[PDB]
Amino acid sequence: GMTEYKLVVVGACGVGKSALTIQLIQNHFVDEYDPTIEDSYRKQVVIDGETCLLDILDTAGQEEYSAMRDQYMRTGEGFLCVFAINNTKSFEDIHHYREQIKRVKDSEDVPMVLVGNKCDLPSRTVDTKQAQDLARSYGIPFIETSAKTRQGVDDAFYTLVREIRKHKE
Ligand SMILES: *CCC(=O)N1CCN(c2nc(NCCC(=O)N(C)C)nc3cc(-c4ccccc4F)c(Cl)cc23)CC1
Ligand SMILES: Nc1nc2c(ncn2[C@@H]2O[C@H](COP(=O)(O)OP(=O)(O)O)[C@@H](O)[C@H]2O)c(=O)[nH]1
Ligand SMILES: [Mg+2]
């Protein structure tokens, strides 16, 4: 049957995990999505000529037990690690998310993509070079996005699918 890619979107509160996912799935920018809602979304896309299904968990890191979070963490194939380019703390927190991903997968070789979001905003506090150097240290792609304008949104998710394809082969 049709190939499915199970993706998990993670990162600190307010970096735009929900806005990015909703821009990807529904092709519009949600100004204030409830910060405590976790939910999953499915969309049929074509990536490099291949029709496939994206199965995406937009995490909200609530301490209540979430069976959806449980199933996606263990069976998820790739992770988008999101920070906002005007949120220095959320860039600094990438190390924690990368560590947690390695731990939940019990694997040093997990498909991931570093995403720097909100690039429509002026006077960023996290330089492109900063994040390019970090992703290079991790050996992962870095993509700059704007969930508001849609810049780089498809690129971020499709690049993560390509990282997963490389891992599987
Ligand atoms: C603000 C609402 C929101 O979008 N989220 C809630 C908080 N959340 C989250 N927070 C943490 N905190 C750890 C603090 C830290 O950096 N220390 C060094 C102590 N940790 C999370 C971990 C995960 C996670 C668990 C397992 C595997 C992969 C993971 F990313 C998640 Cl999903 C969320 C948080 C972010 C979301
Ligand atoms: N200007 C701008 N605002 C954004 C962008 N992405 C998200 N936001 C806003 O940032 C705030 C937090 O976004 P949200 O998607 O709820 O973040 P989450 O906590 O990671 O799920 C919301 O007010 C969004 O409208 C963006 O790319 N550009
Ligand atoms: Mg959210």
Residue 49's CB: how many other CB atoms inside 10 A? 5
Q: Under DSSP, is residue 37 helix (H, G, I), strand (E, B) or coil? A: coil
Residue matched to tokens 């924690």: 96
Evaluate: CB of 37 within 6 angstroms of ligand 2.
no
**Domain 1-169, CATH among 3.40.50.2300, 2.160.10.10, 3.40.50.1100, 3.40.50.300:** 3.40.50.300
49 torsion bin: left (phi>0), alpha (psi -120 to 50), beta (else) = left
From the CA of 35, give the closest atom in ligand 1: 2
Q: Give me the amino acid identity at 71.
A: Q
Supply the DSSP string of 121-165, one letter for each residue.
SSS-SS-HHHHHHHHHHHT--EEE--TTT-TTHHHHHHHHHHHHH
Buried-exposed string 155-167: b where 16+ CB fall within 10 A, e elsewhere: ebbbbbbebbbee
Cβ–ligand 2 distance for 9 under 6 Å, the answer no
Who lines ligand 1 at CB under 6 A?
10, 12-13, 35, 59-61, 73, 93, 96-97, 100-101, 104
Experimental technique: X-ray
Q: Nearest Cα to 114, choosing from 5, 9, 39?
A: 9
What is the crossing angle of helices 17-26 and 153-168, to 10°?
90
Q: How many angstroms does the Cα of residue 150 sit away from the middle of ligand 2?
A: 12
Resolution in A: 2.0
Read off the amino acid at residue 6.
Answer: K
- 39-47 sheet: strands from edge to edge: 39-47, 50-58, 4-11, 78-84, 112-117, 142-144
